[PDB]
A = this chain, B = another copy of it.
Amino acid sequence: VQALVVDNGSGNVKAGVAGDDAPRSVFPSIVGRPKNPGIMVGMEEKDAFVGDEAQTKRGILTLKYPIEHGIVTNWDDMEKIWHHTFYNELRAAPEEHPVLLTEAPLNPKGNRERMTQIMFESFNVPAMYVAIQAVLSLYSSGRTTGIVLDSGDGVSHTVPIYEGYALPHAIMRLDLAGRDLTEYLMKILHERGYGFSTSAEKEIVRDIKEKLCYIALNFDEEMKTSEQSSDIEKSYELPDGNIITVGNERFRCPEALFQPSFLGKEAAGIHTTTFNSIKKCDVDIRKDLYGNIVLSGGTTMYEGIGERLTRDITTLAPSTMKIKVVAPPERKYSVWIGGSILSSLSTFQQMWITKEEYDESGPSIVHRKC
């Protein structure tokens, strides 16, 4: 009767037991291995730190994110992360509860198969189910129709849905996300004379990004508006104590989402992946889709994304239709909350993958029940 909800992002792990309004444990997904040798006798090594503990001391550690673009690169690392979750933070047993793992649309079969296989074989779990992040956000928004476009560090989905039915041919993933905007925010931040070559320093960047970055209404405008610089430059204060001052970098760093040309990729921006994901949907549901666009996931937390996205689509799609982007407060957790509502539904209880069914049917069954 208690469903255990773990949504594995890239660069966050949000885990809380079902029925709560906000997740218990929110900690970045990081596996630190101390680079230099330990000296002081009596210290507890704990060879590989994990999660928040390992982001409290980042000066000693070489951090490796195990998830890059929503696809596990290194399993040992992830497995260790989950272990940290269930034991050190959720404080729930593996064998007692069913758990809900979350996954990205169009994600290689390898992640499903090997993900569950690692859940049943190494951990022991009674039942399991892995749902597309996008759709889960839609439960949270509590409405039955709309595009759900989320962007987490790894991946950015656009999954349209019409009145409860999902469109498998419309789904569209772009790879511009939080970690490409940080790994970009360095290439730009060099311009000012600052420079960050190291992992720990990359996370310092990520903080800069979260605090000081906004998205311009019209970028061509603001690039001119910054010639005369008054309140645009905000002073960020490092863990060091040195005082940085970031210029244009504030609004040209997050803009990479709308123009990927900057990052160098040939993909289309967010506005043309939303709009395009619609244009693949039949001409009859476009009304509802244009109406219900729901932002989700962290990367869209930037101040003023709603306005820019709306105006931009409106420019793209015919003027007759009203475009409304619903940007709910506390959307950073939308995927998780959707995990709660979903896992708490009385009819949903039929769909869990069962310890038995896995045992007899092999790990490949995951593909059939998703």
A binding-site residues for B, Cβ under 8 Å: 34-43, 57-60, 62, 71, 106-110, 135, 138-139, 144, 161-170, 174-175, 187, 190-193, 195, 197-201, 204, 237-243, 261, 263-267, 280-287, 290, 317-321, 342, 345, 347-348, 351
Contacts and interface: CB of A to CB of B under 8 A. Distances in A.
A8 B297 CA distance: 45
A237 B319 CA distance: 12
A154 to B, nearest CB: 13
Given A43-B164, A106-B187, A164-B43, A283 B192 contact: no
Contacts of A163: 43, 57, 60
Contacts of A135: 39-40
Copies held by the complex: 5
A43 B266 contact: no
A108 to B, nearest CB: 4
10 contacts: A34-B165, A41-B345, A58-B282, A58-B284, A59-B162, A59-B282, A59-B284, A71-B193, A201-B283, A241-B321
A60 B240 contact: no
Given A240-B283, A241-B317, 14 more contacts: A34-B165, A36-B166, A37-B166, A40-B138, A41-B345, A59-B281, A170-B264, A174-B197, A198-B265, A200-B266, A201-B283, A242-B283, A242-B318, A242-B320
Given A108-B190, A192-B109, A264 B199 contact: no
A335 to B, nearest CB: 15
A37 B60 CA distance: 41
A4 B280 CA distance: 39
A123 to B, nearest CB: 24
A285 B57 CA distance: 8
Contact of A43 (B40, B71, B144, B243): B144
B318 A198 contact: no
Contact of A60 (B165, B187, B191, B267): B165
Nearest to A196: B283
A108 B59 contact: no
A266 B36 contact: no
A37 B241 CA distance: 39
A43 B243 CA distance: 45
Contacts of A200: 266, 282-284
A239 B287 contact: yes
Contacts of A34: 165
Contact of A109 (B174, B191, B239): B191
Nearest to A247: B109
B169 A263 contact: yes
